[PDB]
Amino acid sequence: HPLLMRLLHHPS
Amino acid sequence: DALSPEQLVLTLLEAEPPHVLISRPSAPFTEASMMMSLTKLADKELVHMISWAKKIPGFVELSLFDQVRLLESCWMEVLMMGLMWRSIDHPGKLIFAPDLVLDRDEGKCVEGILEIFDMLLATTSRFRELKLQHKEYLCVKAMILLNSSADSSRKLAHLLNAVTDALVWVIAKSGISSQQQSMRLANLLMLLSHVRHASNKGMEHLLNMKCKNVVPVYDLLLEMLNAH
Numbered sequence: 001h002p003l004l005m006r007l008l009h010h011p012s
Numbered sequence: 013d014a015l016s017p018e019q020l021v022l023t024l025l026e027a028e029p030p031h032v033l034i035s036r037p038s039a040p041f042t043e044a045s046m047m048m049s050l051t052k053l054a055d056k057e058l059v060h061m062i063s064w065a066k067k068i069p070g071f072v073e074l075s076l077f078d079q080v081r082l083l084e085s086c087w088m089e090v091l092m093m094g095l096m097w098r099s100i101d102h103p104g105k106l107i108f109a110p111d112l113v114l115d116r117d118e119g120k121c122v123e124g125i126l127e128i129f130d131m132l133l134a135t136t137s138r139f140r141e142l143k144l145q146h147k148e149y150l151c152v153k154a155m156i157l158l159n160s161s162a163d164s165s166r167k168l169a170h171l172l173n174a175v176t177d178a179l180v181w182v183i184a185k186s187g188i189s190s191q192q193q194s195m196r197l198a199n200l201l202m203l204l205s206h207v208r209h210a211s212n213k214g215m216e217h218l219l220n221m222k223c224k225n226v227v228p229v230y231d232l233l234l235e236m237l238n239a240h
């Protein structure tokens with residue numbers, strides 16, 4: 001789940 | 013207080029993702045280009061769904077494990093719930109985006125999708141018949157996320173309870189009898205089985221389109237789909 005975890009932790 | 017029914021509804025209202033503006037191809041739809049339009053849209057909406065979920069009070073406080081599995085479990089259904097709301101006042105049509113409006117019969121160009129379109133339209137029509145309100149829609153969509161799939165399970169149950177309490181409160185604003193508020197509540201929740209059913213068929217159909225190489229899928233949609 002790398003992209004999901006990034007988007008859960010990175011704001012944008 | 014951040015989770016009073018009124019405050020919670022307002023937070024969900026402000027949390028709504030923006031309109032994903034996408035257009036039709038200049039050319040008429042083929043199997044390939046319809047699927048490319050729909051998957052491109054879905055991926056973009058997947059990006060915005062994660063941001064939406066992070067704005068639901070207490071969602072980021074959940075375990076990272078729970079945040080992942082809830083979004084993984086519910087995303088297609090939430091996507092479909094969004095579509096039906098956008099399409100509620102437009103019989104015979106699916107308003108995928110403001111500039112991407114498909115008639116029922118246009119699903120004939122993609123193999124297997126027409127049956128799913130009919131499920132989506134049929135379920136949308138029941139929601140129109142019930143006169144689904146925007147604030148009822150907001151609570152229900154949040155309930156799909158939170159009811160999908162130690163201290164985190166308690167926080168999840170509590171958060172699910174608060175959104176449910178908010179829906180009961182929205183329904184109670186109509187000033188109908190306590191009998192009729194219960195009937196309306198049941199009627200709305202019973203329709204979610206049909207949305208879930210449509211999402212399971214949509215998932216299956218998308219998996220088949222990917223394996224048969226009818227369309228390439230990328231980014232977040234690909235990842236969610238590889239995960240199952």
Ligand SMILES: C[C@]12CC[C@@H]3c4ccc(O)cc4CC[C@H]3[C@@H]1CC[C@@H]2O
Pocket residue numbers: 050051053054057091092094095108125128213214215217218219221
């Ligand atoms: C998942 C599919 C592509 C993406 C479609 C979509 C795309 C965006 C959206 O908001 C809702 C839906 C529901 C129907 C979905 C389709 C049903 C079958 C198809 O494979």
